[model samples]
Structures are given as structure tokens and as C-alpha cells.
Target: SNIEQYIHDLDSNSFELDLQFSEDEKRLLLEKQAGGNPWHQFVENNLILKMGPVDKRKGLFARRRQLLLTEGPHLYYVDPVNKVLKGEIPWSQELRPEAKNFKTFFVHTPNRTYYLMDPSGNAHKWCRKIQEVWRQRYQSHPDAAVQ
Candidate 1:
């Protein structure tokens, strides 16, 4: 629950490290050439985006527009509405066009991760993982829990 909230707080185009999961969490890196999940969907989806403390405070819209997709060790979600919250990913400049033209990848800010994306940085595969995480995080919600 707390992990979900922490991810909810990430700003656009940013990332935060999971020091707690450090021992258990291995680095899910973007292969110098990205493609396919390196591990299980759960592990593949779990990733961390790195960002600075001060930078984390700004509004994602203040920087740009688009739903911010976060890459945790195994999760992703959007603000629905942009506001100051903790653990929010930043809007990545590199992904701006992609965000507009395609739904393959999501870029918020300083963090760049693909739960199960291609080399183009698209998150279509990862989006499924993201939605699964959302359903798990909000299982109480009838809409989110739907099988």
C-alpha cells in the first residue's frame, strides 16, 4: 500500500530509488539494446526511476503534459490529474513525441525505465503490467478489480 502511494507521488520526468528493496531488488536495467522482459512479469514490471529531491516537488504539468507512467520493481499508474504528490515520475523529453504519436512508452522526467518495453522505449507490454499493478493496488475499487 505504501509502495503504491510512494509511486503515486513521483513527479513527471523523474525517478526514485528503492533503497528498501535494494537487497531484494536487483537492477532491472535498460539493455544497451532494449527489448523483451529480462525476468518474470512481476519482476520485469518492478523498476525504479531516479530523481533529485528538490526536483520532485514540481508539478508534472508545470513541466509538460501527458499521463506519467512509472516503472517500479513491478508497477505503474498515472496522476489522472496533476498535483504535488510524492514519488511522481517526470515527463521525459525523449518520450514526448512517442507519448503523442503512440502509446508504446511513457516518459515523465529524470527516470527512464521500461517494465517490458521495446528498444524504442514503448511500454505497450509494460502497460499490461502497469494495469495489473493498478488493479492490485486498488483491488477494493470495483473498476480496478474487474477480471
Candidate 2:
């Protein structure tokens, strides 16, 4: 419950790392990623815009999944095939557009570059929108600077 609250507070200005989850508590995050009860409320109800057939790399293994959801600056990485929250990328300027093609565009984060495949090939537009939202929230939200 506290973790869920921490995630919700991210909309204001809370830093994710500051809200530490114990070893057992960390497993609970995976439940959220899998479209469980409260995660839908936080991700679907509170946040807007779901895009991708994005691919994330774990060392030599590349997983094909959707970048299922985000709110404010937090990014949730989901395994589309299995419907699990593999991981999440914390908010940053580093989550920027890298390149594009007729079917896909690139989202470059600090650790990985995701290839987002959209039938319309307009993924960059969505990336820009997210960046705009991040800037607005970070600048104006009462929480402001995320530490």
C-alpha cells in the first residue's frame, strides 16, 4: 500500500528510490506491473497515453514488450507477451527520441534504447508529448525538484 502511494506521489514530485521497498516488498511491484488491482487505478485511471511494441535489452538477451504505461515521468516496462512488469525506468531527460523509420522510432534511456513500433509510425510525437508533460510537472508541481 505504501509503495502504491509512493508511485502516486510521483505525480507530484517524489523520487522513487527514496521510497525503499524491502526484499519481500520489492516482489509486490511485479504484481502491479501485471495489471493487478491498484496498479490499474494508478496507471490507467491517472495516466494517459499507452504506446509501443518497444524492445528492451538485458545484457545479451533482448525482450520484446510494450512500454505499457507512464505517469508524469515514470516509465513502466511490461512484457507484453506474458503480461509482467519486467522493469521500470525512472524519469529523466535521457528518455529522449533517438531516431525513426516507417514503422518504428527509438526511445533512448540511460541504459537501453527501445525501438517502438507503431503502425502509424508516429511514435516520436508521443515521445515529445511525454517530454513536455515531464517539463511542465517538474517545473510547476509543488514537489518540484525530484531528489
Candidate 3:
């Protein structure tokens, strides 16, 4: 349906266009995710490794936060037994995820780089999925040859 296409257009536009959903649109989007669709997602609640942003941060030690990746392809971290959202990783083409080792992977974003650890050995699969999902976010696909 056109709605799906429209939603896709929204996602594609929001990235580079710097477009944001207005209040009503944002509410609708939330409603949609609140069981408006078939209620499906994958690779849930992976552990996130906190070593500070790639660019800069204060003194740090190893820390863990349960992370949730959404169809917005958004990265959200929750704490306190899934009670609330601690923060989210914003979107951009620079938000690239790469598997560093068997249990560690990094998501590089505009201002900060997030190091995440998935102990289930699905690092390859997770990054592959991130590549597939996040690639569509660009207004134009940089991976292709275009003038």
C-alpha cells in the first residue's frame, strides 16, 4: 500500500534531509509501533559495551546496557529492568556497525562511536542485518556509482 511507501519515504527523507516528524506524526508513529503492525522484530536485547564515544568522553571503565534496535532502525538503550529509555543513538550514514571480534562490535555514529558486545556469537549476523537495514536510510545510496 501507499502507506508503506510513505513510511519508507519518511525514513529515507529524515536521514539527510534533517526532517523530523511533527508532533502528530510522531504520535502516529508511536501508535504504529505500539502493536499497530504484526508486532515483529529481531535480535532483541543485545548487550552494549560502553567505553565512551569514538570522538571523546570522560574516564571510563567497562559497562553494559541492554540495547534495543528498532525498525526506525534506531538504537535505544534501556535500563532498570526495561522500565525506561536511557538514551538513543541517532541516525545518519555515519552510523556504521562493524564486528570487531567474536563478542565485540562497534557502531560508529556522527559524534560518538558505540562499542557493543553480543556474547551469543551473532556479531556477524547483527552487523549484516545493520548493513541491510541502515543502508536504505540514505537519501542516495553512497555504495553505488552515481554522478
Candidate 4:
């Protein structure tokens, strides 16, 4: 119960999230205004992609580890050696509206593009939560382009 309350408080504008995006994405946000647009420039501060199972039986030193996908005020690859901090590029020049019947969408980082297809079938809930958060942020700051 305490953890849930903490998470709720964190999600409710208390967390100082340092988001990452590309120069181009920032430019687009600067050039555009957020009013009635369905799309708003936003970045997932810490989106992780699970590549494979975590089991020592599969291999020695194999265990659950979350590889950070985005960091700071720029999207970049946090490769094993931590060499590159390449700026992120948009998945597409324009956002494609999410399909009413589908839960898949695209997000781009500097090194890769992602079609977030939720095999677990629970991602839509998270997606909706994100949108709701954006909506709340937008309501609080009507002129802000990035939510």
C-alpha cells in the first residue's frame, strides 16, 4: 500500500523527470504549438526493452537486468561500454494516429526504431495511463509543447 501510494504521488507531478529527445524533435516542438493537435512531443524518460529471458541455467551470470533505453535531455544509446550518446531521431516525420483496435506504436531512439507491440497484452493500459498523464500536464500548462 505504501509503494502504491508512493508511485501515485510520484506520477502526480512530483517526479522531476529528465526526459530525452533529439534536436530535430526539440525543433519540431519549438516550431509547433500544442492546442488541438492530437500529437505532442513527449519522451519516455526510462523505457526498457527486455531482449531475452534471465536465467543462470541459460547462461552463467544470466539474470534479470533492466537495460536503460533513454537518459538525460537527449536520446542516446547506453551501450555496454558507454561510448555513444547519439541524439535521437524521430521514428517518422509525423506521428501516425494509433489504431483503435491495435496497441502497437512506434518510438525511435538514436540507434534504433521500435514498434512497441505488447505481446503481454497489458501495454495498452500503460499507454492509456501515459496519455492521461500527458493530458493532466497539458491542462496545467496549456501552452507547453512537450508533455
- TM-scores of the candidates are 0.24, 0.49, 0.53, 0.30
Give the CA lDDT, 0 to 100, for residue 98 in model 1. 22
Best by TM-score: 3
| lDDT ranking, best first | 2, 3, 1, 4
Lowest-scoring 10 consecutive residues by lDDT in candidate 1?
Answer: 49-58
Against the hidden true structure, what lDDT does model 3 obtain?
A: 0.50
In the range 19-120, model 2's lDDT, one tens digit per residue, is 244655545654554554333433544332344455454467556755544545566766756667777655675566644665566667788766556544
lDDT of 2 at 87: 70
Give the Cα error of residue 37 in candidate 2, in Å: 11
Per-residue lDDT for 1-147 in model 3, tens only? 122222432121111111234556545554554543321222142211111112212247544454555555566655434455557778786788888887677889888887766644456655665676675666467478752
Candidate 3 residue pairs in backbone clash:
54-113
Cα lDDT of model 1 by residue, 1-147, tens digit: 223322322344433333333432333233310344222222234344332111111334222222223354222233324532323333322322123222334433345542212333333433443444444344577364354
lDDT of 4 by residue, 9-52 (tens): 22211221122335555444333324321111232423221111
Candidate 3 — number of clashing residue pairs?
1
Candidate 4 residues lying further than 4 Å off, grouped into runs, are 6-103, 106-114, 141-147
Off by over 4 Å in 1: 1-103, 107-117, 120-122, 142-147
Task: Please list all clashing residue pairs in model 4, or write none if there are none.
Answer: none
In terms of TM-score, which candidate is stronger, 1 or 4?
4
| By TM-score: ranked, best first | 3, 2, 4, 1
- For candidate 1, the lDDT comes to 0.33
